[PDB]
C-alpha cells in the first residue's frame, strides 16, 4: 500500500466517523469528538469524490445540525479543518461554524 504517516493517521478519522455514525443511528445525541470526526471524514471523502474546496466549504455546514449533538457542542466547534488529496493534489478545507 506504501502508507505514509498521514495516510496511517487519517485512517483513524474515518474509523472514528464510522463509530460516531453508528452512535447517531441508534439515536444518541453526538458529543464533541464524534461530531468533529463525522464532519472531518465527510470532507476527506468529499475530496476523494472530486468535489471542490468551495463545495465542501458549503456542504460541511449541513452535515450535522444542533439537534444531532449535545448541548454546547455547536458552540465548542469554531471550525473544522482537514487536508485531503483532491484531483488537483492536497488542499486544505476549513468548514467554519459547521453546526448551527
Amino acid at each position: 500500500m506504501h502508507l505514509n504517516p498521514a495516510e496511517k493517521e487519517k485512517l483513524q478519522i474515518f474509523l472514528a466517523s464510522e463509530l460516531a455514525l453508528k452512535r447517531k443511528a441508534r439515536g444518541l445525541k453526538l458529543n464533541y469528538p464524534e461530531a468533529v470526526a463525522i464532519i472531518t471524514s465527510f470532507i476527506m471523502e468529499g475530496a476523494r469524490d472530486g468535489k471542490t474546496v468551495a463545495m465542501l466549504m458549503e456542504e460541511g455546514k449541513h452535515v450535522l445540525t444542533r439537534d444531532d449533538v449535545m448541548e454546547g457542542v455547536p458552540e465548542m466547534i469554531d471550525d473544522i479543518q482537514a487536508e485531503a488529496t483532491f484531483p488537483d493534489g492536497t488542499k486544505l478545507v476549513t468548514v467554519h461554524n459547521p453546526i448551527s
Binding site: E71, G72, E75, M76
Partner: protein
C-alpha cells in the same frame, strides 16, 4: 442556563486604552501605488517614506489604537488618524534608524528623515 463550555461572562463597562496620555489627530496620505498598513506600536515618524504627513508630529508617538491592530492606507488614500504618546523611557532604537536614542532629539530625527526622503519634513 444553556451551557456554553468555557464561555465568558464579562463585567460591565469599557476599557480605556493609553489612558492619561496626550492624543493628537493628524492627516496622512499614502502617496505610493501599493497599500501600507501601520501597526499600533511603530514609532509613527519612522513609517514608510511614501506616507506624507507632518513628520514632526509623529515623533515620540504611535497610533492610538488597540494593541496589535493596524491603520490601513490604500494606494492614494488620505485620512486622519489619532496618535498617542510613547511611554516607558521614550526612546526608540532600530526600526528605520531615525531615532536610535531619546525621542526628544527632534531636530536630529527630522534631519535624518529629510536626508533619507521620509515625506513631510518641513
Amino acid at each position: 442556563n444553556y451551557i456554553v463550555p468555557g464561555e465568558y461572562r464579562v463585567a460591565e463597562g469599557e476599557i480605556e486604552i493609553n489612558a492619561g496620555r496626550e492624543k493628537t489627530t493628524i492627516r496622512v496620505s499614502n502617496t505610493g501605488d501599493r497599500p501600507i498598513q501601520v501597526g499600533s506600536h511603530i514609532h509613527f515618524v519612522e513609517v514608510n517614506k511614501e506616507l506624507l504627513f507632518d513628520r514632526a508630529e509623529g515623533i515620540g508617538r504611535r497610533l492610538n489604537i488597540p494593541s496589535g491592530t493596524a491603520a490601513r492606507f490604500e494606494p492614494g488614500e488620505e485620512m486622519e488618524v489619532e496618535l498617542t504618546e510613547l511611554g516607558g523611557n521614550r526612546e526608540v532604537f532600530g526600526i528605520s534608524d531615525l531615532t536610535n536614542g531619546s525621542v526628544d532629539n527632534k531636530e536630529l530625527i527630522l534631519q535624518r528623515a529629510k536626508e533619507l526622503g521620509y515625506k513631510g519634513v518641513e
